[PDB]
Amino acid sequence: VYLDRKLLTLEDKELGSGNFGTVKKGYYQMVVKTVAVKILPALKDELLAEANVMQQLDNPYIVRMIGICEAESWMLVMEMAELGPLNKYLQQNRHVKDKNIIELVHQVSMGMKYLEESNFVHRDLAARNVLLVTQHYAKISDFGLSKALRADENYYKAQTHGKWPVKWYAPECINYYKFSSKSDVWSFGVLMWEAFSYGQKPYRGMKGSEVTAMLEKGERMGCPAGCPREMYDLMNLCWTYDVENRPGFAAVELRLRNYYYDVVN
Numbered sequence: 001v002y003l004d005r006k007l008l009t010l011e012d013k014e015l016g017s018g019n020f021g022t023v024k025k026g027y028y029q030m031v032v033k034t035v036a037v038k039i040l041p042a043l044k045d046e047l048l049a050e051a052n053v054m055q056q057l058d059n060p061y062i063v064r065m066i067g068i069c070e071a072e073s074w075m076l077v078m079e080m081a082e083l084g085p086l087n088k089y090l091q092q093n094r095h096v097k098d099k100n101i102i103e104l105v106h107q108v109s110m111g112m113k114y115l116e117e118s119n120f121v122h123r124d125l126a127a128r129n130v131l132l133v134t135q136h137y138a139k140i141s142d143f144g145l146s147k148a149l150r151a152d153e154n155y156y157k158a159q160t161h162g163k164w165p166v167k168w169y170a171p172e173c174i175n176y177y178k179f180s181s182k183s184d185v186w187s188f189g190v191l192m193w194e195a196f197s198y199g200q201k202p203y204r205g206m207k208g209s210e211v212t213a214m215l216e217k218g219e220r221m222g223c224p225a226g227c228p229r230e231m232y233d234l235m236n237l238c239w240t241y242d243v244e245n246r247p248g249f250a251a252v253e254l255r256l257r258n259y260y261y262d263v264v265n
């Protein structure tokens, strides 16, 4: 978990930015491994909790944490996913085939199925947080808002409504501050829409309160251009208002698995 600063070489190139600080490209001596380094009392405790979640995860469709390092600032060292965020990649590559989109979306469902089995809630499942190793290999990242579920509870109860990605949140998250694996299923539906819309932002030109009002009317985002009917049907099934009737990740992954192999053959 605790890495040697002497073995870490940070580059001038910045991969991303947020409230925490920045994400930069780096190199760590193991063979030398190319890494993405998240560089930062509240923010420090958030990074330590994020690292504790990532250390417990072992799946090919989840970004692996190398370890943590305390130097000029607190650092969270992760394996490098060269192609970067899914939303930005699809915005730059509009000629990416529909079969390729299903493939990447199915890989996210496989990673989320494992996360569901591991009893962890993502709480930030969006296209910007899906990183590409190759054009045919996707991994789930950004575990900053992620929580390890209690052994006696199937949901995480947030005490306060913080800086939340409301457009990706299920109604129970907005109304009761309850976050379950089925809440991540709703986010996955929005992620599916984003992927088939080639990195377009969901609910464009709308306020968070307007989105809540839209979903209460029973209204959902329209079918993206070129998106298959079966894939839009899954988006709508992920967008089931009532938690109990909404499918889990095992049912979502199976539907994607079967449809992907139908397109392949």
Ligand SMILES: CCOc1cc2nc(-c3[nH]ncc3NC(=O)N(CC)CC)[nH]c2cc1F
Pocket: 015, 016, 023, 036, 063, 078, 079, 080, 081, 082, 083, 084, 085, 128, 129, 131, 141, 142
């Ligand atoms: C052309 C390279 O573009 C990028 C590659 C990137 N590779 C990463 C990466 N690899 N491993 C982890 C990360 N980054 C992140 O986890 N985040 C937080 C979601 C920064 C986007 N972030 C990237 C951001 C980029 F703009």
